[PDB]
Amino acid sequence: SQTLRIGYVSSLLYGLLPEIIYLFRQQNPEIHIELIECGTKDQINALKQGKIDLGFGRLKITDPAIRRIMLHKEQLKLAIHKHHHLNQFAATGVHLSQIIDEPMLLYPVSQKPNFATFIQSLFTELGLVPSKLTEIREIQLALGLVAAGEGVCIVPASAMDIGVKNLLYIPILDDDAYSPISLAVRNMDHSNYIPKILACVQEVFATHHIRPLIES
Amino acid sequence: SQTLRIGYVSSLLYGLLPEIIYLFRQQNPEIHIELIECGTKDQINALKQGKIDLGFGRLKITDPAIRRIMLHKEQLKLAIHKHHHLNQFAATGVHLSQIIDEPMLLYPVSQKPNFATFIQSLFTELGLVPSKLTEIREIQLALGLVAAGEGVCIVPASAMDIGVKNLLYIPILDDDAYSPISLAVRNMDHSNYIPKILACVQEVFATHHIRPLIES
Numbered sequence: 001s002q003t004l005r006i007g008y009v010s011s012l013l014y015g016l017l018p019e020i021i022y023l024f025r026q027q028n029p030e031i032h033i034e035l036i037e038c039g040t041k042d043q044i045n046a047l048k049q050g051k052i053d054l055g056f057g058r059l060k061i062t063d064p065a066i067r068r069i070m071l072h073k074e075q076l077k078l079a080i081h082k083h084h085h086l087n088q089f090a091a092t093g094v095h096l097s098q099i100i101d102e103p104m105l106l107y108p109v110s111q112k113p114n115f116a117t118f119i120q121s122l123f124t125e126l127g128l129v130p131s132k133l134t135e136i137r138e139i140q141l142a143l144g145l146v147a148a149g150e151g152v153c154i155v156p157a158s159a160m161d162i163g164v165k166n167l168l169y170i171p172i173l174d175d176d177a178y179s180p181i182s183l184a185v186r187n188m189d190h191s192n193y194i195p196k197i198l199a200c201v202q203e204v205f206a207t208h209h210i211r212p213l214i215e216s
Numbered sequence: 217s218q219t220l221r222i223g224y225v226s227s228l229l230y231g232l233l234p235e236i237i238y239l240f241r242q243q244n245p246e247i248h249i250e251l252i253e254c255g256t257k258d259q260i261n262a263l264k265q266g267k268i269d270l271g272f273g274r275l276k277i278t279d280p281a282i283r284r285i286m287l288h289k290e291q292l293k294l295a296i297h298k299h300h301h302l303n304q305f306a307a308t309g310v311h312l313s314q315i316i317d318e319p320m321l322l323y324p325v326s327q328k329p330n331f332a333t334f335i336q337s338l339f340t341e342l343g344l345v346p347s348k349l350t351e352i353r354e355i356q357l358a359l360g361l362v363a364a365g366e367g368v369c370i371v372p373a374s375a376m377d378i379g380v381k382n383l384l385y386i387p388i389l390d391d392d393a394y395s396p397i398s399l400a401v402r403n404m405d406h407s408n409y410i411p412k413i414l415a416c417v418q419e420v421f422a423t424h425h426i427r428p429l430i431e432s
C-alpha cells in the first residue's frame with residue numbers, strides 16, 4: 001500500500017479535478033490517497049519538503065527543483081446578472097478596459113499571492129485601474145452577490161458550473177485573460193503515479209471534450 | 217435616506233435568496249441595501265444590537281426577543297458519488313441509521329451552532345453516533361470532495377443545484393430530516409421593509425412554482 005499526498009487549491013474542486021482524482025483512485029485501489037488543501041503559492045515548498053507529492057494549482061511559477069506541467073489554460077468570463085446592461089456583449093464578449101467602472105467583486109480573501117492579486121495584475125499590466133473594487137472572501141459568495149445585484153465578477157470558465165442562478169457569463173476577449181491549471185511534481189520524482197494521473201487527466205479532458213495542452 | 221442591513225448565511229446564495237433580494241431592490245430603489253455575511257447564531261445578537269435588520273438563517277435558533285418567520289423547509293439529501301454503494305437507494309431513499317459508519321463530511325467551518333452541529337444533532341436525537349466525521353470549511357469544498365471520493369455529505373435540497381458533477385442526492389427519509397429557511401427580525405421591529413421583503417419572498421417562490429408557508 002503506497003500513500004499519495006495530493007495538494008489542491010479550492011478553485012479546482014468545482015472543475016475537472018475531483019473526477020480526475022476519482023478515476024485515479026478507482027483504477028489504483030492499492031494507493032491510499034490523502035487530499036490536502038494547499039495554496040498554489042505553498043505547493044512549491046510543500047513538494048520540496050516532501051509534505052505533498054502532487055500539487056494541482058494555478059501555478060505561474062517555475063522552480064528549479066519542480067517539474068511544472070501545464071495541463072490547461074482556462075478562459076476567464078465576466079459573471080453578470082442576466083438583465084445587466086453588459087448582456088449586450090453575451091455573444092461578442094468584452095475587453096477589460098470596458099468594465100473598469102463597474103462595481104466589481106474580487107475574491108478570495110486569503111494569504112497572498114492568490115486569485116485576487118492575479119486578477120488585479122491583469123488590469124495593471126493592461127494599464128487599467130478598476131474604480132469600484134470590493135473584496136469578497138470566496139468565489140461562491142462573489143457570484144451570489146452578483147445575482148443579488150451587487151455588481152460583476154471575473155471568474156475562470158469552470159466556475160460557470162457553480163450553480164448560482166440568473167447569471168450570464170461574458171467571454172473576456174483579452175489574450176492574457178486566462179488562468180492556468182498546473183500539475184507540479186518534484187524533478188527527482190519518477191513514480192508511476194505521475195504518468196498514471198496524467199493518463200487520468202487526458203481521459204477526463206477527452207470525456208468533457210476539452211483539448212489539453214499536454215500530449216501523452 | 218433608508219438603509220436596510222441584511223444578514224445571510226452564505227450557502228443560501230445558491231438558492232432563491234439572491235432573486236428575492238434583486239426583486240426587493242428593483243421594487244424599492246430608494247432603499248439602500250447592505251448585504252452582510254452572518255451565520256444564523258450570530259444573527260441573533262446582530263439583530264439585538266442593530267447591526268442587521270433582517271437575518272436569513274439556515275437552522276432553527278430561537279430567542280425571546282427575535283421574531284422568526286419560517287419561509288420554507290428544505291428536505292435533506294445524502295450527496296454521494298454516483299458509484300457509491302448507497303446508489304442502490306437512489307430510487308427510494310435512506311434513513312440516517314443506514315449511514316452511521318460511512319466516512320462523512322460536515323460543513324461549514326464557521327461559528328457554531330451551524331449546519332454541521334444541526335446534522336450531528338439529528339444523529340444524537342436518534343441515539344446514533346457517526347463513526348467517521350470530517351469538518352470541511354464550505355459546502356462547495358465538501359461536495360467537490362465527495363466527487364473526489366472522500367465520502368458522503370448530508371445537504372439540504374437546494375444543494376442539488378450547486379453543479380458539482382458525478383453526484384447523486386439520496387432522499388433522507390426520517391421525519392426530522394429537513395432544514396428551514398427562516399427570516400429573523402427583532403420582535404420590536406415594525407418597519408416598512410418587513411412586509412416588503414416578505415412580499416418578495418412570496419413572489420419569487422410563486423415565480424418558481426414553489427409553495428411557501430407564510431401568513432401572507
Ligand SMILES: [Cl-]
Binds near residue numbers: 225227274355
Ligand atoms: Cl450552511
Ligand SMILES: [Cl-]
Binds near residue numbers: 225255274275329330
Ligand atoms: Cl449558520
